[PDB]
Amino acid sequence: LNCTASQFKCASGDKCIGVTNRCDGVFDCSDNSDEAGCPTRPPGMCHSDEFQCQEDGICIPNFWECDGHPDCLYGSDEHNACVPKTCPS
C-alpha cells in the first residue's frame, strides 16, 4: 500500500519519510532519494533566495541585504547603492 503525499515515497520504497525530510540535508531513507534530488545548483553563484556577498561571495539570506546590519565582510549586504528606507517603525 502507498502512503500520504506528505510522506515522500522513497525510490527504494523501504521507508515513506515525510517531504519535510525530502532534501533536508539528511539521508532519511535508503538510496538518499530524499536528498538525491536537491536542486542546490551553486555554479559559483549563490541560490536565488540567498544573497551573494560582493567581496567574498559567501551566501546569506536575502533578508540580510540592506537590513541595517553589516552581515557581509565589508557590509556589501548594506551596500551604499541600496539606500534602503528601513523604517524602524
From Swiss-Prot:
PTM per Swiss-Prot/TrEMBL: A fraction undergoes proteolytic cleavage of the extracellular domain at the cell membrane to generate a cytoplasmic tail fragment. This is internalized into the early endosome from where it trafficks in an LDLRAP1/ARH-dependent manner to the endocytic recycling compartment (ERC). In the ERC, it is further cleaved by gamma-secretase to release a fragment which translocates to the nucleus and mediates transcriptional repression. N-glycosylation is required for ligand binding.
Protein's recorded name: Low-density lipoprotein receptor-related protein 2
Domain notes: Two overlapping PxLPxI/L motifs mediate interaction with ankyrin repeats of ANKRA2.
Organ and tissue specificity: Expressed in first and third trimester cytotrophoblasts in the placenta (at protein level). Absorptive epithelia, including renal proximal tubules.
Positions of disulphide bridges: 3-16, 10-29, 23-38, 46-59, 53-72, 66-82
Subcellular location: Apical cell membrane; Endosome lumen; Membrane, Coated pit; Cell projection, Dendrite
UniProt-annotated binding residues for Ca(2+): 24, 26, 28, 34-35
Subunit and partners: Binds plasminogen, extracellular matrix components, plasminogen activator-plasminogen activator inhibitor type I complex, apolipoprotein E-enriched beta-VLDL, lipoprotein lipase, lactoferrin, CLU/clusterin and calcium. Forms a multimeric complex together with LRPAP1. Interacts (via PxLPxI/L motif) with ANKRA2 (via ankyrin repeats). Interacts with LRP2BP. Interacts (via NPXY motif) with DAB2; the interaction is not affected by tyrosine phosphorylation of the NPXY motif. Interacts with MB. Interacts with BMP4.
Disease with which this protein is associated in UniProt: Donnai-Barrow syndrome: An autosomal recessive syndrome characterized by complete or partial agenesis of the corpus callosum, congenital diaphragmatic hernia, facial dysmorphology, ocular anomalies, sensorineural hearing loss, developmental delay, and proteinuria. There is variability in the expression of some features, such as diaphragmatic hernia, corpus callosum anomalies and proteinuria.
Positions glycosylated per UniProt: 2
Natural source organism: Homo sapiens (Human)
Entry's family note: Belongs to the LDLR family.
Functional description taken from the UniProt entry: Multiligand endocytic receptor. Acts together with CUBN to mediate endocytosis of high-density lipoproteins. Mediates receptor-mediated uptake of polybasic drugs such as aprotinin, aminoglycosides and polymyxin B. In the kidney, mediates the tubular uptake and clearance of leptin. Also mediates transport of leptin across the blood-brain barrier through endocytosis at the choroid plexus epithelium. Endocytosis of leptin in neuronal cells is required for hypothalamic leptin signaling and leptin-mediated regulation of feeding and body weight.
Domain LDL-receptor class A: 2-39, 45-83
